[model samples]
Target chain A: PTHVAIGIRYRRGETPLPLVTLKHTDALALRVRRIAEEEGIPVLQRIPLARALLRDGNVDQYIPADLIQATAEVLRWLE
Target chain B: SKRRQFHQELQSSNLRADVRRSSVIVAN
Candidate 1:
């Protein structure tokens, strides 16, 4: 495991919230994405954004206020 | 309209139940 490969969390209205866990490995991250795809979860990826959210934002809570834009950017395509 | 622009992500008004509840995230 290394740097967070995937950051998982929630959002309410414009707010991007916290995560269950930050998967810091390529394998685990890919697995999560694969599951999302298989289940049609609309998995979108932004490595740099994921990295920052995990590092700067508190786990299981809303992401940092400053990184809110990045959160928006990351979730931009999801429906 | 069927969509709402939330920040950079313009989401559909009809979001998945889990999405509205627990939601989720992804990495690459």
Candidate 2:
């Protein structure tokens, strides 16, 4: 309730790609930092690849339909 | 190295979803 939902999709080595649905305004920065530490990669080095693509004027790929609905619900709770 | 390159390639070649337009209306 009263939250922001964001979806993150990533691939880890040979593992199948996984989608992680989370709160947008939650501990996003912290979670990214933690993931970088765990993966031994630089924080910024581990950019939200999908997010970057989206920002780069690409809207035709990887839509987070489920998360969007969840986010709407959260927003409604806030209203 | 190949995997890393593949990741980079994916980044470069694939289009990503826009976060800004990903909003939905909800009833209160």
- Evaluating just chain A, the predictions reach TM-scores of 0.62, 0.25
**Model 2: per-residue lDDT, tens digit, A1-79?**
2222233333335323223322233354344334434544322221243343233311223335544444333434435
TM-score leader = 1
Off by over 4 Å in 2: A1-25, A45-79, B1-28
lDDT of 1 by residue, A14-64 (tens): 443544333345666566555556555555667677766656764335567
Docking class of 1: incorrect
Evaluate model 2: give its lDDT. Answer: 0.32
TM-score: model 2, chain A? 0.25
Give a tens-digit lDDT track for model 1, residues B1-28: 3233232243334223223333455564
Fnat by candidate, in order: 0.38, 0.00
- Root-mean-square deviation (CA) per prediction: 10.9, 14.8
Which residue pairs come into collision in candidate 1?
A: A18-A61, A76-B9
